[PDB]
Paper text:
In spite of dramatic sequence divergence, poxin structures from each group reveal a shared core fold and head-to-tail dimeric architecture confirming poxins as a single enzyme family.
The structures of the cabbage looper moth Trichoplusia ni, and monarch butterfly Danaus plexippus poxin enzymes resemble self-cleaving proteases from positive-sense single-stranded RNA ((+)ssRNA) viruses, and bind their own C-termini within a vestigial protease active-site pocket. Close examination of the high-resolution 1.45 Å D. plexippus poxin structure allows complete analysis of the interactions between the C-terminal peptide and the surface of the protease-like domain. Notably, the protease active-site pocket is entirely distinct from the poxin nuclease active site, which forms at the dimer interface between poxin monomers, explaining how 2′3′-cGAMP nuclease activity could evolve independently within an ancestral self-cleaving accessory protease.
Numbering used by the authors:
A (entry chain B), B (entry chain A): 3 to 241
Amino acid sequence: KSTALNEKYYGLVENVTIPASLHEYNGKPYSKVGNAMPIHCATQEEKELLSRTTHHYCDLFTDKLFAPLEELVFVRLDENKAEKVFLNRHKRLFLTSSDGVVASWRCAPTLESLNKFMAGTPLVGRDGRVVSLLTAKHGNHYAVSHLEGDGGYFETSKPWEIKDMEDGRLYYGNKSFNSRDELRAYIQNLPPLEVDSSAPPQPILLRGKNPRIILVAENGRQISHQYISSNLITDVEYL
Amino acid sequence: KSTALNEKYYGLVENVTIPASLHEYNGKPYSKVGNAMPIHCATQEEKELLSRTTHHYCDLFTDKLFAPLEELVFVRLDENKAEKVFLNRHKRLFLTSSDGVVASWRCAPTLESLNKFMAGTPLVGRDGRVVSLLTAKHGNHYAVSHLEGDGGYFETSKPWEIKDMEDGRLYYGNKSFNSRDELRAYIQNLPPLEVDSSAPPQPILLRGKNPRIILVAENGRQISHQYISSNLITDVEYL
């Protein structure tokens, strides 16, 4: 029934009827809308089928595009009520996902709520069409995964590795180093970059003051290295 | 002598002495500071050596880190004069470069000047240490290539391909399509992703209202696909 786990609803509550069904994975509840659901709530066998028809959204499976994301959304509380909230495009949460085909990332806008929503809780726009489902949060800030904003994906079956950086340290591939000399010595002695179906690329998120996304080959050679914003919230809880 | 090509200097001109040497490539002038220079001003034989010791800056070779970038810089006009300007972190130019080792990009902050500076013109901070050299410009806005702002690089010997998008088209790898069905059919029938030293990855910048960076394999399979901001100025002139 309820997608909000708290009994007393907070915020601006309006009478909006938004369908959802309730499910469970790994001891945590989640909701679906038809076949649409968060990727992190899917078993591997589910991902292997849902990945073949979905549109590419970070941490969401859906066979049809979601409706457009505007200035506000309604977040489902229960069968008959929803919370009306503004979208915040200034405060962004960094989402990651993998479905066995693509490893996606997104600098997602957020909404702030004192309610405790489960994964997969649907959000609708003014006309009642589903615009997104909830995925991850930090504190009271919930990401809104959609097709706007900075984001991307890597073509690989490997899941993300999520790591933390140290100030002043240097990073290449899977490794970190005290100095450029140590880093360059390592690079020089690696075999040449190679990628194939038995050697899929590994995506890495490095969190910290100067955060990075790295794509590294099975043999240790870098494929890509990117600097992302220190303002992104990368300490996130997948619901 | 002069790194500004106009005879009458505009702006706030101060007595600051900044060393530089004058050079020419393909009939266009450029300046160096010691061994430091813009990548786009180097011959292939020069790149092949300079690439082996340089630090990673988009479109700049330097064996030593540049000094920190703060709120303002002085841009060399001639042997004894420089223009005092503010750094603008709101208006960003998108830079690309390749040195045969890495294909880099950067969302660079800018400075505005009515003077016409050549490529490689040095910029210094309050203490006179070189902070960057000029690379590209759009209008009166010059990029400041440095270690700040979003950016990255791909490990490859290929140079960038720079393309313009068309309304209504979908993009995968090297190709564009009028419908999702045709795009998905194309992907399904490519050989599996493969990369090696005789099949290096190809970086592509797609410019337009919904711009992209795509890294594609020699055989046409994607390695990565990312969405970047339509506010980035991607129409730039390498000086």
